[PDB]
Amino acid sequence: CGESCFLGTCYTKGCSCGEWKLCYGTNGGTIFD
């Protein structure tokens, strides 16, 4: 996900801020940056 979890929380639902400070979407088991 082209997110920006600068603080920690991401905006796009499903996108979780990964350790490498990058939110990855995991909606319905579907993983996408």
Specify the length of the chain in residues: 33
The C-alpha angle 29, 18, 32, rounded to 5 degrees, equals: 40
Strand partners, 9: none
CA dihedral for 26, 12, 9, 5, sign (positive or negative): positive
Distances (CA, A) of 12 to 5, 7, 22, 29, 30: 10, 14, 12, 16, 14
Indicate the burial class of 15 (C-beta count within 10 angstroms; 0-12, 13-18, 19 or more): buried
Technique of determination: NMR
**Longest CA pairwise span in the chain (Å):** 25
Q: Which helix (H) or strand (E) holds 32?
A: strand 30-32
Sorted by where each begins, the domain ranges of the chain are: 1-28
Q: Which residue has the tokens 């909606």?
A: 27
Closest CA to 1 of 28, 27, 29: 27
